[PDB]
């Protein structure tokens, strides 16, 4: 399982919208950020009422089951948001990743 990759771009103080696969099975749905040095993907938002503290109040997860898609919108972007993310499903967040998203916040 080698994961496909997409690339997104947002503006400082702006917003970006990340598209993710929505498994037809009612599973736990999350977007995570791969924290370098730790070697793992930490959850930023999930359908299990968890928002990473740095993203609390600026991230939204919305579902559209008829399109097999859910959307993660990040607002009030900052340079610390630039990095590698990943869409995913399941109770293991490090595993069960479904696609990889790389975000670059530019001026």
């Amino acid at each position: 399982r080698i994961l496909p990759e997409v690339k997104v771009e947002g503006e400082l103080g702006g917003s970006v919208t990340i598209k993710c696969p929505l498994p037809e099975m009612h599973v736990r749905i999350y977007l995570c950020r791969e924290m370098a040095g730790s070697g793992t993907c930490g959850t930023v938002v999930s359908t299990t009422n968890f928002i990473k503290a740095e993203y609390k109040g600026r991230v939204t997860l919305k579902q559209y089951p008829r399109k097999n898609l859910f959307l993660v919108e990040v607002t009030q972007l900052t340079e610390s948001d630039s990095g590698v993310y990943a869409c995913g499903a399941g109770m293991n967040t490090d595993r069960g990743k479904t696609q990889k998203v790389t975000l670059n916040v530019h001026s």
């Binding site: 730790s38 793992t40 993907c41 930490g42 959850t43 299990t48 503290a53 967040t93 490090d94």
Partner: protein, 112 residues
Amino acid sequence: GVALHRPDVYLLPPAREQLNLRESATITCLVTGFSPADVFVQWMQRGQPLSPEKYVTSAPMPEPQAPGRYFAHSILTVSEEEWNTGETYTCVVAHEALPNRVTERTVDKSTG
């Protein structure tokens, strides 16, 4: 007239299935075997007391294996990141029967 009995403090690390979720981690402080029901449990990290927002301390309930004795649990919930960075957490228990009226136990990722 009744005897005063010291608390025994046991500290339980987060479950692997919770950390596999890569969300939040729950550290449980178990205070058992004290007879005066009045007990104060507080958490400290990095030598500093933690905000009561982060932990909940249970009410003293009778201990089933010993009448005349009580127990209480205290759950501290932190981010998985803090736990996996190696942060060291301490459960502070205050009770009349303790030598200095207080005792402590400590856990980190490396303890268990």
